[PDB]
Amino acid sequence: YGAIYSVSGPVVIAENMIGCAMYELVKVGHDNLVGEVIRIDGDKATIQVYEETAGLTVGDPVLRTGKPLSVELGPGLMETIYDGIQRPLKAIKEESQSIYIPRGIDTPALDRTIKWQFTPGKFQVGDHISGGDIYGSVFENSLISSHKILLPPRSRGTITWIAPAGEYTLDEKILEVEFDGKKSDFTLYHTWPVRVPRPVTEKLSADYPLLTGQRVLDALFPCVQGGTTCIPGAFGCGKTVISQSLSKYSNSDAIIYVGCGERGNEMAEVLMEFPELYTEMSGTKEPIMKRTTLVANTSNMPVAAREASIYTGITLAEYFRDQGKNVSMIADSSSRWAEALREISGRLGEMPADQGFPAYLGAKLASFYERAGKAVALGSPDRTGSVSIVAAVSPAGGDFSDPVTTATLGITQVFWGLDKKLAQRKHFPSINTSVSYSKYTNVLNKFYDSNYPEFPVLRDRMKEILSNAEELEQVVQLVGKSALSDSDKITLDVATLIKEDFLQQNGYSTYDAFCPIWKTFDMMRAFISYHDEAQKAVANGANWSKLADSTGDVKHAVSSSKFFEPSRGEKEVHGEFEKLLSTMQERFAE
């Protein structure tokens, strides 16, 4: 343990710190304030205390934890709520009985008082074990059962003792591994450097789609499981709807939510909304909080915690990927994370690069987004997992002036472009399809050719229809509406129908709460069939007014595609679409 030497603001210099490492967390003061070591000069080490540094005398002990900013990985992560430092908010509240977070509170980030069921893996005594090898399983939840216990990625050696099946806590030993001497002993949990990405044997190319459940996001601008997206994340735009959809209807088997500096009243909103979520499963209705970890982190929190919130979240997501689970990591307020990073850079004194942001903001964002992606996990068995990052780009939504916004839009491949104007116009989920884009359609063409062949063609057809509709709307604004040709009128009418029924999804409604991929494909096929039939009728020379008068029934039938409830599912709803598609042709032909 060292001693304090100088305190001038949050920066603290500690004399007698020989053996201290850079970016190492130390316990500063008699209240055990946690702080990282910024620079070392011989004995003296410079420390940024995470909490408030007031009241720190000279000579206060500075214990050396010996590890960088670490993450508590193990059973007991799932339902808990954390901060950037990963301190349990619920456990802190229960321990202190106060609405505040006391300075230097050392509640363990994982519940050491919970007995966890443990079932040993295929690895027996004497069998070689390497990093990431699943040597056991833990029944944690209902949604997430069999929490696969992994050997730490850096750890290696030969098993000497393994814990027999039973109930264990995180504190007591589970595995004893010998590597040129029994220098290793493993419990149910382990720690990982937060800045250091968790290694994998191979990072595959993200091919499977991330079905968010929304028709627009799943058809026009799809994301791949393991892909990085981008959302404006401005208030009054539907980012809450997107977050709830990704939480409960997505394909991801786990969710990591990080606030990294969002407002307090907001944190209250998310922390009171997510526990109220319920995702229907095969068994019964169980909370979406059973598979989602909230890294709640407000503006009042330490700037170091705000800057490390997204890193803790991505490290948790990497851990759950290393178990073969598909994780979606919803990053709310990446711009506020960048603001925290800029505040830390200014405190350290580094020169600004663009709009006051540090010179390494782009590199940090690129590394963070590259930490995502599908990857076969380290160690046997050969399970495969994926981490998808959904990042609310900026409260300054989609503003290229912000360097963080420019970097996020340049690095992420999907931008879902919420529009405040459409949100005001009662459009849900308020996606501005003109500016929104996705670069994952090229890689998703393989999955579509494997499962739903016509999907890329129909998606491109609807994109062309929407572009032609924008052109026709501009033409009808410039000149008279009747000046448009029959084909232009048909395109405008079909696009209006598409916006009203297909694009506009009522998430709160029970029928269209979660549109499956097959239902979205069927609706897209029906809409394209209707548009093609109308175009063929126009080419035949029939009057468009008479055609619409005759095909109002077909228009109502295709608009009912939203109202077909996917509760029946599979061929039960697919067969109904065949009749609807057939009715869109016989009536049109007559």
Partner: protein, 464 residues
């Protein structure tokens, strides 16, 4: 025969220093050094047994400031042992590199053996003697109309691609590599990836595999998750491999330096870590010097049949060419190929904007013998009429189509039939320079002979 390797059979023990005085940012201030070299690359051993390489950047009396490529996290003053190699950073180069994949630091990530070194060359290299240079006069027919007729790439040129985040800059440079060939009769590409993502790295590697280039390409992949400080040395290693191949083995080397924007970003981060001048936009005041030491390693030399052609792929931060990275790169290199978002959103591929583009080696390699005699005049006339088309489009958007003159209407028609037919190609359609010149002459035949004021009278009489 070769007496250079005779000095190789010598063992030079290395001093192991535990005297790490201090660490700050990416630098370690290391004291009690015995005669520190100015640019020695040291092997720094962490307490955890990890070994990170670092090179000294400043040396006081018995004190060397080492910057480590991997980063200073986890470095300690009690336990970190620093082993001074006593020499600058040297990459083991051999003809066996062609066909291998290397990391950002030059270590092989191809799951093969370490390079059986044929020689050790300093990555920083040396400036080529201007008297020893040969001006590149051998035109390359890249198969792209916008790059072969409007602009023109001679063999030892430094011709970057200026693009933005979402533009198909990777696809266009991949098209050039798979179609590059001397206009009047093979390239051994050397690829340097700096800060690109796994998608881009896999795209380039798979494109080389598909085109069959991987048998003659060396890949230096420094992905986005790789250390940022070694994005500085990745292009130096790739260009030292290229210099070896070309000038010594007598090969013709294409050098693709993808994300020189990321290289300059790493350079700015390193400069801002120190107390250095901010130049413009925060980039170091010596960024011109560093980017020049990168770019000007290309070209041809006298007495050797090898050459280096560089196509540094550059990402424009805000699609502006006045940013420091694009401005300094345009000042240093011998041209630029400008990929345009205004055309990519228009749907054109390749979305190459011709007006901001340039090739300083078109005068040479364009002529009566190297190419068809009309090439220079046709290129100048196409530039003039393309600009007239842009001005006519702006004036149409302002004051309607009616107010445009006959020349303005002809220029708008030429602009449409030029962007939609001349610039636009398939991703795998290679157009011979004569084919593209015939298309260009059709586009000029849109105009009357009188309005073609750029063409010399003899050329116009013999080709209109």
């Amino acid at each position: 025969n070769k007496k250079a390797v005779e000095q190789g059979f010598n063992v030079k023990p290395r001093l192991n220093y535990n005297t790490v005085s201090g660490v700050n940012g990416p630098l370690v201030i290391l004291e009690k050094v015995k005669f520190p070299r100015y640019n020695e690359i040291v092997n720094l051993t962490l307490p955890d047994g990890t070994v990170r390489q670092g090179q000294v950047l400043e040396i006081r009396g018995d004190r060397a400031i080492v910057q480590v490529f991997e980063g200073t996290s986890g470095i300690d003053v009690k336990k970190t042992t620093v082993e001074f190699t006593g020499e600058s950073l040297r990459i083991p180069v051999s003809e066996d590199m062609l066909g291998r994949i290397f990391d950002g630091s030059g270590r092989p990530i191809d799951n093969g053996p370490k390079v059986f070194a044929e020689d050790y060359l300093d990555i920083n290299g040396s400036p080529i003697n201007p008297y020893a240079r040969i001006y590149p006069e051998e035109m390359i027919s890249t198969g792209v109309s916008a790059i072969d007729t409007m602009n023109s790439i001679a063999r030892g040129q430094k011709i970057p691609i200026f693009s933005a985040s979402g533009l198909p800059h990777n696809e266009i440079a991949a098209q050039i590599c798979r179609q590059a060939g001397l206009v009047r009769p093979n390239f051994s590409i050397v690829f340097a990836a700096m800060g690109v993502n796994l998608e881009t790295a896999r795209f380039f590697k798979q494109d080389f595999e598909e085109n069959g280039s991987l048998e003659r390409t060396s890949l230096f992949l420094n992905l986005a998750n790789d250390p940022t400080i070694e994005r500085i040395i990745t292009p130096r290693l790739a260009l030292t491999t290229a210099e070896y191949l070309a000038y010594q083995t007598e090969r013709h080397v294409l050098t693709i330096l993808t994300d020189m924007s990321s290289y300059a970003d790493a350079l700015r981060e390193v400069s801002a870590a120190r107390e250095e001048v901010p130049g413009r936009r925060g980039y170091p005041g010596y960024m011109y010097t560093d980017l020049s030491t990168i770019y000007e390693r290309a070209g041809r030399v006298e007495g050797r049949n090898g050459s280096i052609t560089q196509i540094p792929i550059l990402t424009m931060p805000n699609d502006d060419i006045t940013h420091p990275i694009p401005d300094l790169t345009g000042y240093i290199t011998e041209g630029q190929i400008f990929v345009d978002r205004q055309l990519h959103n228009k749907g054109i591929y390749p979305p190459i904007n011709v007006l901001p583009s340039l090739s300083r080696l078109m005068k040479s390699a364009i002529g009566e013998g190297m190419t068809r005699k009309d090439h220079g005049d046709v290129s100048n006339q196409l530039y003039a009429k393309y600009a007239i088309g842009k001005d006519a489009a702006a004036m149409k958007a302002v004051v309607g189509e009616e107010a445009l003159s006959i020349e303005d209407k002809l220029s708008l028609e030429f602009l449409e039939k030029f962007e939609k037919t001349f610039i636009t190609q398939g991703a795998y359609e290679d157009r011979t320079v004569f084919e593209s010149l015939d298309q260009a002459w059709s586009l000029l035949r849109i105009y009357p002979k009188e309005m073609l004021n750029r063409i010399s009278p003899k050329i116009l009489d013999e080709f209109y």
